[PDB]
Every structure is written in structure tokens, then in C-alpha cells.
Amino acid sequence: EAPNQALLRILKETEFKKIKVLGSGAFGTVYKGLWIPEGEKVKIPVAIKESPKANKEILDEAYVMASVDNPHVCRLLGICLTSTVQLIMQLMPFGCLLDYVREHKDNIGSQYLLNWCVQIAKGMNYLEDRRLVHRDLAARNVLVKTPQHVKITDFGRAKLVPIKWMALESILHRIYTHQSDVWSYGVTVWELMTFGSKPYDGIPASEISSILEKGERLPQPPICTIDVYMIMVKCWMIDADSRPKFRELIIEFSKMARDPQRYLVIQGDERMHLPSPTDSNFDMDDVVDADEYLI
Ligand SMILES: Cc1cc(Nc2cc(NC(=O)c3c(Cl)cccc3Cl)ccn2)nc(N[C@@H](C)CO)n1
Numbered sequence: 001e002a003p004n005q006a007l008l009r010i011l012k013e014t015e016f017k018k019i020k021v022l023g024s025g026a027f028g029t030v031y032k033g034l035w036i037p038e039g040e041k042v043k044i045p046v047a048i049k050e051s052p053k054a055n056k057e058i059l060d061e062a063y064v065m066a067s068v069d070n071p072h073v074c075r076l077l078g079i080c081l082t083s084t085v086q087l088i089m090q091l092m093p094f095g096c097l098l099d100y101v102r103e104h105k106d107n108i109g110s111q112y113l114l115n116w117c118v119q120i121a122k123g124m125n126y127l128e129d130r131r132l133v134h135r136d137l138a139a140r141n142v143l144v145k146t147p148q149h150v151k152i153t154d155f156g157r158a159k160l161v162p163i164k165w166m167a168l169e170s171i172l173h174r175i176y177t178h179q180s181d182v183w184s185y186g187v188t189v190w191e192l193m194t195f196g197s198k199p200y201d202g203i204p205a206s207e208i209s210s211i212l213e214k215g216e217r218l219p220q221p222p223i224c225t226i227d228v229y230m231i232m233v234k235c236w237m238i239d240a241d242s243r244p245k246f247r248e249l250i251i252e253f254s255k256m257a258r259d260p261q262r263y264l265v266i267q268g269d270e271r272m273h274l275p276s277p278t279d280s281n282f283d284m285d286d287v288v289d290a291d292e293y294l295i
Contacts, residue, residue, distance in 0.1 A: 035088065065089070119149070167179070
């Protein structure tokens with residue numbers, strides 16, 4: 001296909017300062033930091049992600065992340081070439097959407113939930129245009145820049161095992177398509193609508209494939225109207241080509257986001273509010289968010 005003319009930016013270790021540790025998982029460590037390029041008078045808040053095999057895996061992710069550019073996808077700002085290479089990306093100050101829905105349940109209204117669905121579908125449809133199959137879309141892999149702006153991340157599995165988020169063809173035949181990402185999208189929506197419930201909780205992964213073959217699906221979340229659950233059910237159909245396209249998901253959730261109380265029934269949804277760029281939210285003097293630092 002077309003040549004990938006994306007720029008791989010190499011950043012000097014001296015150009016950024018690590019503030020604290022955000023977390024540690026089954027990969028390494030995520031740090032919070034500040035990238036202060038050369039003599040540019042800017043401070044960009046960043047996240048820093050840190051044997052030969054380990055470096056191959058991380059450089060494969062750098063490649064995918066450097067090749068995307070969308071408001072609803074996390075892009076690579078650059079890499080740092082230390083003993084083990086570090087991925088430098090935009091700091092998403094509110095962490096992952098999964099923990100966010102769990103921690104802020106009492107202030108999350110229908111407007112926020114339906115807008116997140118549109119934004120996730122937008123990022124996903126962009127990955128589809130760029131011919132990338134995510135293979136790991138889940139609420140844990142959606143980051144929160146602000147409560148009103150979310151982005152898809154974790155390109156470690158992205159191609160040109162999370163059993164409970166996979167399409168039955170993926171579990172059984174290792175078949176991955178944009179239509180199998182649509183299944184993962186349905187599960188992600190379910191995670192949001194339940195305010196972060198674990199899908200098929202208590203059920204071991206070995207039984208999932210068989211549960212799906214019989215025709216069992218995730219239950220209707222209490223806040224979901226038949227209109228919203230119908231969309232989730234459509235994402236979990238056996239015939240992959242029967243599932244909605246992401247471009248249809250943008251349309252469907254957009255219509256709903258225009259009249260959110262008609263599609264999600266939440267007690268107190270209206271008098272609920274989350275941090276906006278009015279006070280608190282944000283030396284703070286020369287800090288510029290990566291979305292405004294264009295080069
Ligand atoms: C308050 C806060 C902010 C933030 N921001 C952040 C996190 C990123 N995390 C990841 O990119 C990440 C994900 Cl979402 C999955 C697997 C590995 C990584 Cl490094 C990237 C950018 N900003 N992350 C966290 N906790 C991380 C451990 C979750 O990953 N907490």
C-alpha cells in the first residue's frame with residue numbers, strides 16, 4: 001500500500017523531567033512528567049512508558065502510535081533511547097475511563113456517557129480508515145484528557161488474550177477484523193453503562209466461548225433503554241458483517257446524545273456535574289497541552 005511517511009521523534013533524556021510514578025502493571029511503569037523542548041519556552045505534560053525482545057515489542061508500539069493522528073486516539077510524541085527505550089506520550093490527567101466511571105458514578109450523566117460512545121466510535125472509525133485492527137479495545141484502554149474528551153490507547157496488539165472482550169471468531173479461530181473491534185466496542189459500552197462492572201463476573205474465561213455459542217450475552221444495564229441495549233446486542237452478533245459499522249455507531253450515538261434523557265435513565269441526571277476547564281482543572285506558566293504543541 002501507501003508509504004508511511006510518519007516522523008519518528010527521538011527525544012533527549014535531559015529534555016524531560018519525571019515528576020512521579022502513575023502506576024505499574026504487566027508491562028513496566030507509567031510516569032507523569034514534563035517535556036521541555038530545547039529553547040522553545042514550553043512545558044508539555046507527558047506520560048513516560050518503560051532485554052532485546054522487550055525493545056522489539058515497545059518499538060512495534062512506537063511505530064503504530066507514530067502512525068496515527070486523530071483527536072480521539074492517543075499518538076506518540078516521541079521515544080527516548082535509554083538502555084530500555086521509553087515511549088513518550090500526552091498525559092491524560094484523569095487516567096483510564098474504566099476507573100473514572102467507577103470513581104465518579106454519582107456525577108456521570110447520560111450526556112457524558114453518550115458523548116464518550118460517539119468519541120470512542122470516532123477514534124475506532126479513524127483506526128478503520130488507517131486500516132488498523134486494535135485487538136484490545138476495553139474501557140481500561142480509553143484515556144480521559146478531560147471528563148468531556150476521551151481517547152483510545154494501547155496499540156501493543158494493533159495490526160495493519162482479553163477473552164471477555166473478544167468476538168467469538170477471535171476466541172475460536174484467532175480471526176481479527178474491524179468487525180471484531182465492533183464486538184469489543186459493544187463490551188466497552190456495557191462497561192460504561194454499568195459504571196465499570198466486570199463483564200461475566202465470576203465466570204472463568206474457559207466457559208465464555210461456550211456461553212456465547214449457546215446465545216447468551218451481557219445483560220441489559222438498568223440505565224439502558226431498549227434503543228441503547230439493542231445497539232450493544234447488534235455488536236455481539238455471530239455474523240460479523242451483521243454488526244454495525246463504526247461510522248453507523250457515530251451516527252446512532254450522536255442522535256441519542258442530542259436528547260440523552262430519552263436513551264439513558266439515571267436518577268439525578270441533570271444536576272450532576274464533573275470538572276470543566278473552569279477553575280481547579282489545570283510553575284504552570286508555560287505549560288501547553290500536546291494537542292496545541294504542533295511541529
Ligand atoms: C491519574 C492517572 C493518569 C494517567 N494518565 C495517563 C496514563 C497512560 N497510560 C497508558 O497509556 C497505558 C494504558 Cl491506558 C494501558 C497500558 C499501558 C499504559 Cl502505559 C497514558 C497517558 N496518560 N494514568 C494513570 N494510571 C495509569 C497507570 C493507567 O494507564 N493515572
